[PDB]
Enzyme design. Sequence first.
Site, PDB file in Angstrom:
ATOM      1  N   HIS A   1      -3.037   1.042  12.054  1.00  0.00           N
ATOM      2  CA  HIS A   1      -2.603  -0.249  12.422  1.00  0.00           C
ATOM      3  C   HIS A   1      -3.985  -0.984  12.775  1.00  0.00           C
ATOM      4  O   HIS A   1      -4.512  -0.055  13.903  1.00  0.00           O
ATOM      5  CB  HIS A   1      -1.685   0.074  13.525  1.00  0.00           C
ATOM      6  CG  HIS A   1      -1.477  -1.374  13.998  1.00  0.00           C
ATOM      7  ND1 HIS A   1      -0.750  -2.398  13.426  1.00  0.00           N
ATOM      8  CD2 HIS A   1      -1.526  -1.889  15.417  1.00  0.00           C
ATOM      9  CE1 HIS A   1      -0.829  -3.582  14.455  1.00  0.00           C
ATOM     10  NE2 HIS A   1      -1.142  -3.283  15.411  1.00  0.00           N
TER      11      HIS A   1
ATOM     12  N   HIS B   1       1.056  -1.226   0.027  1.00  0.00           N
ATOM     13  CA  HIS B   1      -0.096  -0.043   0.071  1.00  0.00           C
ATOM     14  C   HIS B   1       0.887   1.341   0.001  1.00  0.00           C
ATOM     15  O   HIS B   1       0.381   2.182   0.451  1.00  0.00           O
ATOM     16  CB  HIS B   1      -1.156   0.075   1.165  1.00  0.00           C
ATOM     17  CG  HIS B   1      -2.188  -1.393   1.223  1.00  0.00           C
ATOM     18  ND1 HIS B   1      -3.243  -0.893   1.147  1.00  0.00           N
ATOM     19  CD2 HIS B   1      -1.619  -2.474   1.620  1.00  0.00           C
ATOM     20  CE1 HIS B   1      -3.881  -2.064   1.126  1.00  0.00           C
ATOM     21  NE2 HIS B   1      -2.972  -3.120   1.641  1.00  0.00           N
TER      22      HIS B   1
ATOM     23  N   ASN C   1      -9.931  -3.062   3.112  1.00  0.00           N
ATOM     24  CA  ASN C   1      -9.814  -2.969   1.756  1.00  0.00           C
ATOM     25  C   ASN C   1     -11.021  -2.866   1.049  1.00  0.00           C
ATOM     26  O   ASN C   1     -12.336  -2.554   1.691  1.00  0.00           O
ATOM     27  CB  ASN C   1      -9.019  -4.393   1.038  1.00  0.00           C
ATOM     28  CG  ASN C   1      -7.582  -4.462   1.534  1.00  0.00           C
ATOM     29  OD1 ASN C   1      -7.090  -3.553   1.654  1.00  0.00           O
ATOM     30  ND2 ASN C   1      -6.992  -5.632   1.353  1.00  0.00           N
TER      31      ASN C   1
HETATM   32  C1  HDD Z   1       1.192  -9.459   8.689  1.00  0.00           C
HETATM   33  C2  HDD Z   1       1.285  -8.944   7.955  1.00  0.00           C
HETATM   34  C3  HDD Z   1      -0.234  -8.184   7.232  1.00  0.00           C
HETATM   35  C4  HDD Z   1      -1.174  -8.632   6.518  1.00  0.00           C
HETATM   36  C5  HDD Z   1      -1.696 -10.432   7.079  1.00  0.00           C
HETATM   37  C6  HDD Z   1      -2.003  -7.798   6.157  1.00  0.00           C
HETATM   38  N1  HDD Z   1      -1.238  -6.716   6.097  1.00  0.00           N
HETATM   39 FE1  HDD Z   1      -2.041  -4.452   5.929  1.00  0.00          FE
HETATM   40  N2  HDD Z   1      -0.010  -3.994   5.849  1.00  0.00           N
HETATM   41  C7  HDD Z   1       0.972  -4.728   6.595  1.00  0.00           C
HETATM   42  C8  HDD Z   1       1.114  -5.684   7.055  1.00  0.00           C
HETATM   43  C9  HDD Z   1      -0.159  -6.873   6.681  1.00  0.00           C
HETATM   44  C10 HDD Z   1       1.921  -3.722   6.985  1.00  0.00           C
HETATM   45  C11 HDD Z   1       3.537  -3.975   6.643  1.00  0.00           C
HETATM   46  O1  HDD Z   1       2.324  -3.401   8.571  1.00  0.00           O
HETATM   47  C12 HDD Z   1       1.651  -2.486   6.454  1.00  0.00           C
HETATM   48  C13 HDD Z   1       2.694  -1.701   5.343  1.00  0.00           C
HETATM   49  C14 HDD Z   1       3.140  -0.524   6.289  1.00  0.00           C
HETATM   50  C15 HDD Z   1       2.195  -0.181   7.118  1.00  0.00           C
HETATM   51  O2  HDD Z   1       2.309   1.000   7.951  1.00  0.00           O
HETATM   52  O3  HDD Z   1       1.532  -1.239   7.396  1.00  0.00           O
HETATM   53  C16 HDD Z   1       0.111  -2.559   5.891  1.00  0.00           C
HETATM   54  C17 HDD Z   1      -0.748  -1.803   5.044  1.00  0.00           C
HETATM   55  C18 HDD Z   1      -1.849  -1.846   5.008  1.00  0.00           C
HETATM   56  C19 HDD Z   1      -2.749  -0.838   4.425  1.00  0.00           C
HETATM   57  C20 HDD Z   1      -2.234   0.710   4.262  1.00  0.00           C
HETATM   58  C21 HDD Z   1      -2.569   1.621   5.409  1.00  0.00           C
HETATM   59  C22 HDD Z   1      -2.016   3.112   4.902  1.00  0.00           C
HETATM   60  O4  HDD Z   1      -2.789   3.712   4.207  1.00  0.00           O
HETATM   61  O5  HDD Z   1      -0.964   3.544   5.448  1.00  0.00           O
HETATM   62  C23 HDD Z   1      -4.018  -1.284   4.199  1.00  0.00           C
HETATM   63  C24 HDD Z   1      -5.330  -0.459   3.807  1.00  0.00           C
HETATM   64  C25 HDD Z   1      -4.085  -2.474   4.697  1.00  0.00           C
HETATM   65  N3  HDD Z   1      -2.505  -2.805   4.986  1.00  0.00           N
HETATM   66  C26 HDD Z   1      -5.166  -3.413   4.863  1.00  0.00           C
HETATM   67  C27 HDD Z   1      -4.906  -4.742   5.156  1.00  0.00           C
HETATM   68  C28 HDD Z   1      -6.075  -5.549   5.077  1.00  0.00           C
HETATM   69  C29 HDD Z   1      -7.690  -5.448   4.928  1.00  0.00           C
HETATM   70  C30 HDD Z   1      -5.421  -6.785   5.368  1.00  0.00           C
HETATM   71  C31 HDD Z   1      -6.086  -8.142   5.406  1.00  0.00           C
HETATM   72  C32 HDD Z   1      -7.421  -8.534   5.812  1.00  0.00           C
HETATM   73  C33 HDD Z   1      -4.187  -6.898   5.405  1.00  0.00           C
HETATM   74  N4  HDD Z   1      -3.789  -5.594   5.148  1.00  0.00           N
HETATM   75  C34 HDD Z   1      -3.281  -7.916   5.620  1.00  0.00           C
END
Ligand code: HDD
EC number: 1.11.1.6
Lengths: 727, 727
Positions: free
Chosen positions: A366, A102, A175
Amino acid sequence: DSLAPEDGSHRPAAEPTPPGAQPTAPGSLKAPDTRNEKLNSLEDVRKGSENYALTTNQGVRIADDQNSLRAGSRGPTLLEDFILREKITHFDHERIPERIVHARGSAAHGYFQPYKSLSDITKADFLSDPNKITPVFVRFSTVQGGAGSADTVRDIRGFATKFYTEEGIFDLVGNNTPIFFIQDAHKFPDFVHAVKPEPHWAIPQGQSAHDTFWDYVSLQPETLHNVMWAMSDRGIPRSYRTMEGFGIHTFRLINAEGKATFVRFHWKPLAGKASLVWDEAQKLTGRDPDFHRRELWEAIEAGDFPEYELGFQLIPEEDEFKFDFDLLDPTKLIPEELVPVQRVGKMVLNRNPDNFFAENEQAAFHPGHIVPGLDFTNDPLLQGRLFSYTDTQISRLGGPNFHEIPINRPTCPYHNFQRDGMHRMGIDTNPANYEPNSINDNWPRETPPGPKRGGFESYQERVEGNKVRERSPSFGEYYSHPRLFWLSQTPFEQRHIVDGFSFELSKVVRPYIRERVVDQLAHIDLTLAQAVAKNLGIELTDDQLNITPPPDVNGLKKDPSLSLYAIPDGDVKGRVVAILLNDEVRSADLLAILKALKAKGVHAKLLYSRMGEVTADDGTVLPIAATFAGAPSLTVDAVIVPCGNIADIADNGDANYYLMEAYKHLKPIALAGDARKFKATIKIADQGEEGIVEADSADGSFMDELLTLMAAHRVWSRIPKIDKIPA
Amino acid sequence: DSLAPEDGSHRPAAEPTPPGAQPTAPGSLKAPDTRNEKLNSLEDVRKGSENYALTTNQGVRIADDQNSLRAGSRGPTLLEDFILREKITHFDHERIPERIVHARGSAAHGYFQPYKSLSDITKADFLSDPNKITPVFVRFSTVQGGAGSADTVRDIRGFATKFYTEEGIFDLVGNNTPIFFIQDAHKFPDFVHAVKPEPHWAIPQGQSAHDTFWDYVSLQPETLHNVMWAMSDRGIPRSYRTMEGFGIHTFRLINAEGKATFVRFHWKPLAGKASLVWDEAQKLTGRDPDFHRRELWEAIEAGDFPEYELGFQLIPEEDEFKFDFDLLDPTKLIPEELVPVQRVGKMVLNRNPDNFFAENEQAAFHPGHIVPGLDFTNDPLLQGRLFSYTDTQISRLGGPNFHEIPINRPTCPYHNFQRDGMHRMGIDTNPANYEPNSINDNWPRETPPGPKRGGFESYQERVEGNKVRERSPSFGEYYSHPRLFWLSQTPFEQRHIVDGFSFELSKVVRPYIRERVVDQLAHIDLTLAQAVAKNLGIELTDDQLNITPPPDVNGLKKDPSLSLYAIPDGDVKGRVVAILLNDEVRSADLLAILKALKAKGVHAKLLYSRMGEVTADDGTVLPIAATFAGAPSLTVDAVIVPCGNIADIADNGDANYYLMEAYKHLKPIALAGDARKFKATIKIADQGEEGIVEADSADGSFMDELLTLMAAHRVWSRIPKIDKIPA
Ligand code: HDD
Ligand code: HDD
């Protein structure tokens, strides 16, 4: 020096203005009167510029910001030039790591308010009273692409909302599709590595159309449900304003009496559901890679605030096992035919940021950031997400004090015994940095759980089982949800799904991967598998043709809420129309056109073969927004060509192509008077055809007919007719 | 489970194969026999995978990589799952800050060798012997866009070469135009901020077509020369293999005698100079944003190794002030008509990296990395660059030990008293960490300068002047180089420059900025100013029409080496043709086509309306590379349509459009037999037209004609016929 134009036309008016009418500007300058508690709390860090002296970061005025200090005016630059070095140093360290996923996103400030108190099912303070306004900061995003990647790619979209409540930050990180690709967070790195650019050469950007993604999907059937959603037109939204938002996981609401209710979060777009078509979406990544970011920003500048309705699917604790699918499985949706979405409140996005980097790039959302009245569940994907979002900002935002970065700060009180860390802003005066302490009389102190303003206490869920690395057997079902989605789509939606899969699989170089995905599709629906197979020159085997389709989902053979378009929800406000001008436009047609559009909040862009002005039949001087090639039909929802001297643009290739492109992408087209000469370019019969508005002038019902077409978004009946058409 | 196909088709043959013939792969697996000293030295960190157990980073074998540890199969994830946490932690911290500028780039390994010893003018070891080879690593890039932005944008391109010499790393960090936009490094942040995405909304990506860029340009006429180049077709190269490279600044060559010679560095593309056309380039950012990255990788996999000739413009020290421009002004080029480019050596790029991130993303180039025999000059832009490239990698590469990152390591000895710093790899055994020291007998020791293997000593240039922040008066001339460049371009190159400025300025929202830029153009050339103004609907004033043109550059009224196309330099090896198949291809046409292409090293991509295979008239099974929509004419150099069952594709919209796009983009088109019926789609000529090859069958004559057209790159004579075509 005093370089601005004396007419003050360098500065945009601080009033709502339509897209393209004025230069866009920082939110607090464009709309200084639009305020909220969070926007007001950011005033301590906002910095102006007008009438101030240019200085170093240490406050020293700079006399000459055009030159380095040297020995002689053609001499070597001297190490003592501290002004140069501070300036280059800051420049040299401007970038921070982009988000792992993202990374590409666009954000805005807004506010939320519940329709009624939800105190009976949740003690969350922000949902306790209809008059309680909660400031929000929302970031919409793609998933795969870097921060400099294009907006209109085919991908899932992120929809993250930061609620600045009186009892803490609540981040609803969702999402635009109601399920995720995988079941357990342990496989997140695998799935993401498979979809991202391949490691040897870092190709492709912003696309799942490559071997590693389809290799993974082919070996992990749990992914098929969200893959169906990404291959549909859901994967290419018209705008962040016209897509749905979902929290995906089942969470818990906790009331004051301690009762837990299962909840899935929904966001309904008040502007309705609308998507592009693939060819348009892909070409638009080239013609305007910032289309969604731009559209969001300009909607807000025009007063077309993105509005969303928060809704809850609520399921009593006693009904946990009453469905064919597990409630904790993130690859399964809860059909609205089984559990309706109850309307909870409205969110309005009404102010852009001032500085994208400072507010958008540094924002940290988060899903673990919950408040009393909410709780988690054992969904194994959610469970692992709770670890990741705190961890990741240690590198992304440089340390554990990321909550001190202005956009991330709670607007409510925050006090604890945590100290130091890089970039520490807060200067703690507490004599104690530990508890229990007597030296500060134990302040700040713990607070017992209670109906309002109490401490956080997890719901006492019964846990029973052995320590295992095991997928629940209830999660091992992969084809019924995909099939339910497929069957709920209209016939043109199904076609687009078939085209999405076909196009993506055609970019998979290893043929056996295409075959393996086709075999999976044959476990979902035979019509779907056959149509994709046909487009890939693949023949299904007799075994594949006899694979029994998966069972209906709890008796449902379809659910129309899963379709973008099955149930009309059109909303024209904020849409835009291209008007193709000529050098002697019939001013009467133009007056009728522009006023009808303005009455419905539909924007217009006047296009010509050059910039500057053109003079209408009555002497009206018409300002040109852009050229035909400069603002392609991809960027508008409909095209209108007024009468006048049509021979001026009749043989203009760009003007003819403008209509061919818009025609191919199923957009409404309206031709007045002699503009009907363009019917021959798009091969329209003398008698006319549904989707093309035509009359001797733009009067009477001409505009109402075009607005009815815009309300239906695209002319789906034209699909068979665009099949040919060299465009 | 999930395993390779029985037939071994998952793995690319380890031999040179044409683009599309096999899945691409890491360089060490694609071409294991291709070696050089640097590539071999990276063997300590290269890691395999086949036949090895999956482990944590601590070397513990993992039994189940599909699940987190939980209490019960539907239970909460436990904190003791260290396997999950290490895996997610590494994922969470994958991203490093992208480069401030030139974040988008593609690299490869290769080798260089001089044609003859240059010991009479330089003591640099890498130029001392024709048979002594120096490994290189080259990174090509755009300037403005982030690492996830598109390749074929309009922008300057970077061309950085790291030479791993026996006497130190030498980085030649250049661009594809011979000058830069600004004169003094102190304005670098100003210029870069103006061209980058605007700060309020972070738009637009990879484009200078926005208000702040043209605002800066209009206020800083020193930028006009490089802007002229950016707006010409130089701003949109066909490939990194078909662009020139320049070091820009005047540097010095120091021989063993101590004599200094001023030098400007050149790279001549042995594949010739070739660029796209704007409409093509822009659409290609959408259809394939990774086009240049892909094209470079595939060229190298095919054996079409990018080859460049290093060339030097040499000016004796006594001629420093003999031009009408200052040699140290980086906004001024040195016309080849005045000072010829002497050929020095050849560089060949023959191996792609193994891991993009580790080798390309973490590569650090810096123009201050020079070796004995080279030296700087007082060019004020170059002077400030020396500060920035060491500084920026403290955040980008996390510390001062960035030279220990494998790709950056020198292959020659490096020993000093520097210690510690983040992620220190080198374990120093020296008892001493300071000098002078007696405890290690002062080792490692300083080395006197000398003819070979000597210590670095700066040329003892005389410095005389007061400490001033002042631009040299000699740099205060901004229009003669821009005019020299304009007059050296062919008529169609001039038109494309006109179109570039017109397109870009049409996207500038504040009209006074457009007018100010037109005013600046009127100081360069009135024909140019008038053509741009007409497209913007602007009228030149009488004052503007009377602006005296700038003087010729040292008597030159033009210099043909500044044009891409004035002097034929075409080379078809490595180019690619699209072949539009039908379901009953006349194999005799295909045989002749492929044979002629193969003899000139031109690749082919077989296209169809679906994927899979089609069978020719003689039973030959032809695998389909991509669909007409899937691999647009944008991606090829010419289009050939063989005979067969033309009825099959005669009415296909994409097939017809394919030809119309190729036609509009001035590409050679060849139609054999019944394929000549496609002439109606591109609505032109009956007796034929230069640029369109036609015959009853594809034969020797037909292919010679097509190949001759391809050698001239594009059909510029068709320009007048393309703006009526609706495409
Ligand atoms: C265990 C890891 C993990 C998993 C299983 C998920 N993601 Fe996540 N996502 C992250 C690890 C992550 C992250 C690495 O922690 C991020 C990227 C950087 C951040 O700050 O958060 C993130 C970013 C992030 C963002 C961006 C927030 C922004 O605009 O800063 C959104 C909208 C989602 N995720 C949504 C989801 C949804 C709805 C998921 C499944 C239901 C999902 N992610 C699965
Ligand atoms: C004072 C700052 C300064 C100025 C005046 C220049 N740049 Fe620079 N450039 C940087 C500051 C810099 C940088 C911030 O240090 C960068 C990005 C981070 C990196 O490693 O180096 C960089 C990167 C960078 C790269 C990318 C190297 C890679 O592929 O990693 C190239 C090709 C250029 N520069 C070339 C040029 C040329 C030919 C210039 C003008 C003649 C120039 N730069 C002016």
